[PDB]
Structure 1
Amino acid sequence: SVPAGAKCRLVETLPENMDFRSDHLTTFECFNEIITLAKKYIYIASFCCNPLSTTRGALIFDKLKEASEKGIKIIVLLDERGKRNLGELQSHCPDINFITVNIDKKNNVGLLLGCFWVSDDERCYVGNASFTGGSIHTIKTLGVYSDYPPLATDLRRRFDTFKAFNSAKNALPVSTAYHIKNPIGGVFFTDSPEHLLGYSRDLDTDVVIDKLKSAKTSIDIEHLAIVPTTRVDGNSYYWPDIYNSIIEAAINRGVKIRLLVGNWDKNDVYSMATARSLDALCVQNDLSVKVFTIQNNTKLLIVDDEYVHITSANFDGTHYQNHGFVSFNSIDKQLVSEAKKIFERDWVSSHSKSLKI
């Protein structure tokens, strides 16, 4: 049979200078386990690659260096804008193959996110902890680890999609085995963007909005910002698709929504008006907003204590229209309950003060 939850367990980074405590697997322990149990390959993908920035990030880079010398095919995908440290990486690991990826060469807007590991088509990690020393040591992250072969194999097919966009000289099946119409143990992957989706994969933009509109009781979102206007290039881009489905739940359906976003800029007139209007919604409706100032890459979504959505991208226009990433989705009640515990901890954390304007 198929195990419930697809052998998935929560993984996150809790720095020492932060009051976050949990019994889940740490990101440092997760990456070290993938390298130790590696017998065939290690495929890593993220935007920026800079493990040598912290102590724990350098140890993971050393275990990965020893793996490539033992005969393990290690491929690291990184967007061509995180190419600043490329000369530093190849000088330390001549065996690890580093590949610069530009998924959007037509307009140069789409960035490579992804943020996932996969090894031997058995073990894998999916979260917002990039291959940087910060995400492993000093920055709060969140993700899921799974040693289930059928699930990690479906994630490796996502790696084959992004690998084809290497910036070198000159067929892609865009294959998937599980989606919202056929999950594996109550777990499936949503993908992005739409022009790289193919015909079988599920667009993460549609799946998130569908779960936001199908909400019945609670909506818990811990992202960096929900400001529906993000500045692409040097101009403003208005995209309230996710921002509307949330307020539609709080006003029309009376959903108790708690948003934990990062602190906004005092000079950004766009983030100012977004915040002052969320302040007015907390008075009339059951909306609650708290802000944080720490370095946190967590992108969490929980609906009705029944569905969970952990991703590396942020709920905004720039990400869900151009950026390419893989998002974790699960409806397993036992796995969602563990994610609910994480949001309750962060909501009352000392680093989460109530929104004041």
Structure 2
Amino acid sequence: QRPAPCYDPCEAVLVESIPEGLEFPSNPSTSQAWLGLLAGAHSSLDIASFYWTLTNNDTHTQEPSAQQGEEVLQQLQALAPRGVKVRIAVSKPNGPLADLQSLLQSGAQVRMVDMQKLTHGVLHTKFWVVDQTHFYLGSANMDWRSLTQVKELGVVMYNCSCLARDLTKIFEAYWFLGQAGSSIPSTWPRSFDTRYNQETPMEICLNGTPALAYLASAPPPLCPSGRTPDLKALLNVVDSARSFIYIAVMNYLPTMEFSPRRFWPAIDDGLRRAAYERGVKVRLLISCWGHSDPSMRSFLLSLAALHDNHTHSDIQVKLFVVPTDESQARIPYARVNHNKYMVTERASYIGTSNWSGSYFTETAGTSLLVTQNGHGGLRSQLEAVFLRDWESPYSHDLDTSANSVGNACRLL
């Protein structure tokens, strides 16, 4: 029996951070969505974050481009004293965070999740839940560089209380794990379970149209019985595709990135199966900067060789590099595409994890999966964004020269 449907007028908006200087031949910016959500917050706010560097002092900079971030943090400091219950879960850092301390003295609650001891990973998840009604899910960290100097993609769902509570369940898992003497139970309490998963997705009304949406979580130790693992959701979306698969992730690596080294061909085998068996067109867009793993190159070539007229398989790989000028090269750890999403002709997947084994086995993450039988919607907007990025002059084949790219790219 399918679970109860939801009747809230949910509205999904694609949100993106376009770095300063990037020009294209438009979705709202991440800063606008965050500021609007903070202004409209009245009862509660839950945040799952990786790190907190929102001010020029955090990054030891004097960039005007930090203004948006500096505003956002200030707005966060306004939430607690006016009645909003603020709960913040962060990955355990190397040192105390000034933003978190200031929020703590503004009235917020901050807990550090020590995922390294628990599942040998980090709290890589980045999402917001507002008043149990709205939620943002994307790749934007709590970083000012994530608002003006780094390309980011996410989705903001407004007026969807049911899905917001579904995400609040995962946030509650994180919050419980944030306690000092806490460990992962063998079975989570039944208050953590969900009836909405891959087999029975939640029936929502998206922009006045029925849709099937659900949330997947990783790692498997942080998954109640009824919660679909993130890898299972990703592989289902990959396997159900019949026409095309468009993937945009910062890092794609069919191994365990940090481990004795282990091979992990799950997503790679799924993509190869889609390309060969059903003739699915696979386009893979990988971000490259001066901090990319060089070992990423060879594996990517191992996919690009599958483009062959005899096999009829069509796998193409492009590298997205954000150009940097003399001034922007001084901004530390910026000018990248941090996007993490996949779109087919029939499904949409938006995640907060890079595509490697750890992010699906040890490292926490959440992903939103949407299916809709319309002529468009969120899926069409995702496809349009991917096509714009893919056809932009910032995407290059694996044989391109490094000099004429505009930025340092280890893979080239």
In the superposition, the TM-score normalised over structure 2's length comes to 0.79
1:231 is paired with a residue of what secondary structure? Answer: coil
Write the distance in 2 (CA, Å) between the matches of 1:52 and 1:308.
33
For the aligned residue pairs, the C-alpha RMSD in angstroms reads 2.4
Deviations 1:205-246 (A, max 9, x none): 11211221222110100012322123314x422111001100
Are 2:23 and 1:19 equivalent residues in the alignment? yes
Are 2:203 and 1:163 equivalent residues in the alignment? no
85 and 32 in structure 1: CA distance in 2 versus 1, 3 angstrom threshold: farther
Q: 2:113 aligns with which of 95, 98, 101?
A: 101
Tell me how far 1:20 sits from its aligned partner.
4.8
Deviations 1:104-154 (A, max 9, x none): 5245x2211221101111111111111111222221111111122122121
Tell me how far 1:4 sits from its aligned partner.
9.7
Tell me how far 1:202 sits from its aligned partner.
0.7
Corresponding letter in the other structure for 1:259: L
Q: Which residue of 2 aligns with 1:188?
A: 214
Corresponding letter in the other structure for 1:197: C
Contact 2:73 2:99 in 1 (8 A): no
Are 2:393 and 1:350 equivalent residues in the alignment? yes
Contact 1:15 1:139 in 2 (8 A): yes
Write the distance in 1 (CA, Å) between the matches of 2:273 and 2:42.
49
Corresponding letter in the other structure for 1:302: V
Write the distance in 2 (CA, Å) between the matches of 1:13 and 1:221.
18
Q: Which residue of 2 aligns with 1:58?
A: 70
Contact 1:78 1:100 in 2 (8 A): yes
Write the distance in 2 (CA, Å) between the matches of 1:344 and 1:65.
38
Write the distance in 1 (CA, Å) between the matches of 2:277 and 2:130.
45
Write the distance in 2 (CA, Å) between the matches of 1:61 and 1:287.
42
The gaps in structure 2 that reach 5 residues or longer are 57-65, 183-187, 205-211, 323-335, 401-412
Q: 1:295-306 alignment to 2 at 5 Å?
A: 295-303=336-344, 305-306=345-346
1:281 is paired with a residue of what secondary structure? Answer: coil
Write the distance in 1 (CA, Å) between the matches of 2:379 and 2:153.
14
230 and 264 in structure 1: CA distance in 2 versus 1, 3 angstrom threshold: farther
Q: Which residue of 2 aligns with 1:111?
A: 122
Contact 1:229 1:270 in 2 (8 A): no
1:151 is paired with a residue of what secondary structure? Answer: helix
Write the distance in 2 (CA, Å) between the matches of 1:46 and 1:315.
18
Are 2:271 and 1:230 equivalent residues in the alignment? no
Q: Which residue of 1 aligns with 2:62?
A: none
Write the distance in 2 (CA, Å) between the matches of 1:55 and 1:84.
24
Are 2:59 and 1:31 equivalent residues in the alignment? no
Q: Which residue of 2 aligns with 1:243?
A: 268
Contact 1:5 1:187 in 2 (8 A): no
Tell me how far 1:2 sits from its aligned partner.
5.3
Corresponding letter in the other structure for 1:228: P
Q: 2:301 aligns with which of 245, 269, 276?
A: 276
Write the distance in 2 (CA, Å) between the matches of 1:242 and 1:5.
34
Corresponding letter in the other structure for 1:237: R
Write the distance in 1 (CA, Å) between the matches of 2:25 and 2:130.
28
19 and 267 in structure 1: CA distance in 2 versus 1, 3 angstrom threshold: closer
Write the distance in 2 (CA, Å) between the matches of 1:323 and 1:267.
19
Q: Which residue of 1 aligns with 2:368?
A: 328
The gaps in structure 1 that reach 5 residues or longer are none
Q: 1:76 aligns with which of 88, 91, 97?
A: 88
Deviations 1:27-76 (A, max 9, x none): 11111111111111111111111111422111100111122222222111
In the superposition, the TM-score normalised over structure 1's length comes to 0.91
Contact 2:48 2:126 in 1 (8 A): yes
278 and 169 in structure 1: CA distance in 2 versus 1, 3 angstrom threshold: closer
Deviations 1:172-218 (A, max 9, x none): 43232522213232211111111111211111111211221222110
Q: How many residues align?
A: 352
Write the distance in 1 (CA, Å) between the matches of 2:115 and 2:70.
28
Q: Which residue of 1 aligns with 2:14?
A: 10
Larger Rg: 2
Corresponding letter in the other structure for 1:297: H
Name whichever of 13-22 and 182-191 sits farther off. Answer: 13-22
Corresponding letter in the other structure for 2:197: H
Q: 2:244 aligns with which of 215, 218, 233?
A: 218
Name whichever of 87-96 and 253-262 sits farther off. Answer: 87-96
Name whichever of 47-56 and 258-267 sits farther off. Answer: 258-267
Tell me how far 1:353 sits from its aligned partner.
1.3
Q: Which residue of 2 aligns with 1:208?
A: 234
Are 2:273 and 1:262 equivalent residues in the alignment? no
1:200 is paired with a residue of what secondary structure? Answer: coil
Contact 2:252 2:296 in 1 (8 A): no
Tell me how far 1:268 sits from its aligned partner.
5.8
Write the distance in 1 (CA, Å) between the matches of 2:145 and 2:340.
16
User: Deviating runs (4+, > 6 A) in structure 1?
Assistant: 264-267
